[PDB]
């Protein structure tokens, strides 16, 4: 109630306070509890191999230098008071570009407690790297992590833990990625050893499963229909040289236009994807179909019936092996 009394209490706390020294300097390491409230996962980029995450990052720790008596309330102070207090040097090891929202002010919260407990909240948008195994693309499952670590303080000076155990991270169900579904999330606590010493580590990982529905309609269906369309040449009479030859190449031309456009959406990985094998496989079938008429034309100037039996069978065999291998 008495603002002057509160003002004197706060001024006393900051009087002689050294931001350069951590709480319990020279003593036991200070335990910092962290909880994350996910706001959204805006983007998942295969070309850049990273994802963008927006979250409410909160840290819990005790600073005896900030303990106050006589005020039975939790003091919610202006975010500018954080510049006069010690905060953990928490950083994200796998991030590529991060910032703190500053509209209309810096999205920062400082809440003190009578025993010296400090609640420090930040709203952070971060772009974190996530190496992706695209061998089974687009039927792949990805494990994107967020590594949380202290930059300068070793385990002798600071310690991290998930406040609330497995409930430390909330809002995962709110994530709505158009291309991915959040299968599971995990919380991991461990110690990482470097040349400068051992540092505490907190890891938040998401298992992402790509949605196959878009690629089935956009890519597989046009390729299947063109391959079936190439088999129409077998029904056509052998004397229709203009018709059958035009059918073979235009199907080949159709495959090229589909093949060129599809591969523009992905990075230059040297290994064979599931989509890569399918596009090239279809391009071979239409290529062989046109070759099939070449042998026909040369011999006549039987093979057709053999091709009519084999080509649908081989393509069905190719699909059966393909889908079993990746599903």
């Amino acid at each position: 109630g008495n603002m002057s009394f509160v003002k004197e209490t706060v001024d006393k706390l900051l009087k002689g306070y050294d931001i350069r020294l951590r709480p319990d300097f020279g003593g036991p390491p200070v335990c910092v509890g962290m909880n994350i409230d996910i706001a959204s996962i805006d983007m998942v980029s295969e070309v850049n191999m990273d994802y963008t995450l927006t979250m409410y990052f909160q840290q819990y720790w005790r600073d005896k230098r900030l303990a106050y008596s006589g005020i039975p309330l939790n003091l919610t102070l202006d975010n500018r008071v954080a510049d006069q207090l010690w905060v953990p040097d928490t950083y994200f090891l796998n991030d590529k570009k991060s910032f703190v929202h500053g509209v209309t002010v810096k999205n920062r919260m400082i809440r003190l407690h009578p025993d010296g407990t400090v609640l420090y909240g930040l709203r952070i948008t971060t772009t974190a790297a996530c190496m992706m195994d695209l061998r089974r693309y687009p039927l792949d499952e990805q494990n994107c992590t967020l590594e949380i670590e202290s930059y300068g303080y070793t385990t002798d000076d600071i310690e991290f833990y998930w406040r609330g155990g497995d409930k430390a991270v909330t809002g995962v169900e709110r994530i709505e990625l158009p291309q991915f579904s959040i299968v599971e999330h995990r919380l991991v606590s461990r110690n990482v050893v470097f040349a400068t010493g051992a540092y505490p580590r907190l890891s938040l990982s998401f298992r992402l499963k790509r949605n196959i529905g878009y690629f089935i309609l956009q890519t597989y269906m046009p390729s299947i229909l063109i391959t079936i369309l190439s088999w129409v040449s077998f029904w056509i009479n052998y004397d229709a040289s203009a018709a059958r030859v035009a059918l073979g190449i235009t199907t080949v031309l159709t495959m090229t236009t589909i093949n060129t456009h599809l591969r523009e959406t992905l990075p230059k990985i040297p290994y064979v994807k599931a989509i890569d094998m399918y596009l090239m496989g279809c391009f071979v079938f239409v290529f062989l179909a046109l070759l099939e008429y070449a042998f026909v034309n040369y011999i006549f100037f039987a093979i057709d019936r053999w091709s009519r039996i084999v080509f649908p069978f081989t393509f069905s065999l190719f699909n059966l092996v393909y889908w079993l291998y990746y599903v």
């Binding site: 905060v87 953990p88 040097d89 950083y91 991060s98 910032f99 930059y151 300068g152 400068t196």
Partner: peptide, 14 residues
């Protein structure tokens, strides 16, 4: 070139 500032300046001084 940039130096990351999230959550704090990623600089160490011993």
């Amino acid at each position: 070139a940039d130096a990351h500032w999230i959550t704090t300046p990623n600089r160490m001084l011993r």
